[PDB]
Write a protein that binds this ligand. Structure first.
Ligand SMILES: [Cl-]
Ligand SMILES: [Mg+2]
Ligand SMILES: [Mg+2]
Length: 352
């Protein structure tokens, strides 16, 4: 029932206000995340400076930075295969097909394949030290290549295999959950997680390989922060600002065209977010910005209740609120709540 709700003339006013409020919070969260890295964190030094310096806490060496980088790449490869794809797959295989269909992150917009593929490109970006698919001179890839060309080539191939396997699932993944292609994508993601957390991490950690000193890894950490992390968060800030502006256009003059234009802005803003999921550490994690912007699944019953009662304060939480209160607010806001409000069955919603 909450899944079947339509945007109608009867609820349009409330629907516009829900969209405005969710888009304003996404704008705030992306700005605060970018500022935490680029300007100041916890009222002090910027997180970009703290990470690049690695002078004690939580990173005392360039190796500690790089182990976090690699751990966080392995974590997203694990999340994508075992949970984003795996949770719907295992529900479906057990015979719980209706629960499986609604378990797919980004199904409202039929965007799961592209979303999860961008998560793998986050790994590529972290490993390449770039955003354009070109291997940077100061990348982890180049460091591994100089010591072990075979391991570097196997890692680059494993990243590409996972991205290609997800793209090979027939569009949309929501309608092809039990496919052979789904299983091949899970396999490719598991192989990628393994080569990162086992082979790569162990190889860098071994002092005998001479690639874990600050002289070797400082330029890798600096380039990862300056060319990957900070520009991705800058792009997310800019694109969440544009997404809010597109929601305002739609709310002020609702039309099929304005819904289509706001949906395009949602995909545009999602890209730097999805391409940041290999670095879910530091500010995005500690500030709770990851679940603020990207909780999934949502509390769909609570969304419909908030829409009909215009209880906008239910979307927000404060420092010191208990865990349940924070999660309840996060489960009714963010990119996926805005996605619900903009899309129906993979297409922009229409004005009746
Ligand atoms: Cl989908
Ligand atoms: Mg168009
Ligand atoms: Mg997530």
């Amino acid at each position: 029932d909450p899944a079947n709700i339509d945007y109608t003339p009867e609820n349009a006013s409330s629907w516009h206000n829900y969209m405005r409020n969710v888009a304003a919070l996404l704008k705030t969260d992306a700005t605060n995340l970018y500022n935490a890295w680029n300007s100041s964190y916890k009222g002090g030094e910027s997180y970009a400076s703290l990470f690049k310096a690695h002078s004690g806490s939580p990173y005392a060496s360039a190796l500690s930075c790089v182990e976090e980088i690699v751990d966080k790449c392995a974590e997203i490869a694990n999340e994508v295969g075992t949970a984003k794809i795996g949770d719907p797959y295992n529900l479906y295989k057990a015979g719980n097909t209706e629960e499986a269909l609604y378990a797919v992150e980004s199904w409202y917009s039929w965007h799961s394949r592209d979303d999860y593929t961008n998560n793998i490109y986050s790994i590529r970006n972290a490993y390449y030290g770039s955003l354009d698919g070109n291997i940077n001179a100061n990348s982890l890839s180049t460091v591994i290549a100089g010591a072990n060309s075979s391991l570097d080539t196997k890692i680059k191939n494993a990243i590409q295999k996972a991205a290609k396997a997800i793209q090979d699932i027939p569009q949309p993944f929501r309608n092809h959950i039990p496919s052979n292609e789904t299983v091949a994508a899970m396999d490719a993601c598991a192989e990628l997680e393994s080569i990162l957390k086992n082979d790569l991490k162990s190889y860098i950690a071994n002092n005998s390989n001479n690639i874990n000193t600050d002289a070797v890894l400082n330029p890798v950490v600096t380039q990862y922060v300056d060319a990957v992390v900070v520009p991705t968060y800058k792009s997310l800030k800019e694109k969440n600002d544009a997404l809010y502006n597109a929601v305002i256009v739609l709310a002020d003059n609702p039309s099929n065209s304005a819904f289509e234009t706001a949906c395009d802005a949602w995909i545009t803003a999602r890209e730097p977010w999805e391409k940041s999921e290999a670095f879910l550490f530091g500010p995005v994690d500690e500030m709770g910005l990851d679940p603020n912007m990207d909780s999934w699944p949502l509390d769909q019953n609570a969304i419909v209740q908030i829409l009909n009662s215009q209880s906008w304060s239910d979307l927000e939480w404060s420092e010191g609120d208990d865990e349940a209160a924070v999660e309840s607010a996060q489960n009714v806001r963010g990119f996926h709540t805005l996605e619900f409000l903009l899309y129906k069955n993979g297409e922009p919603r229409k004005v009746q």
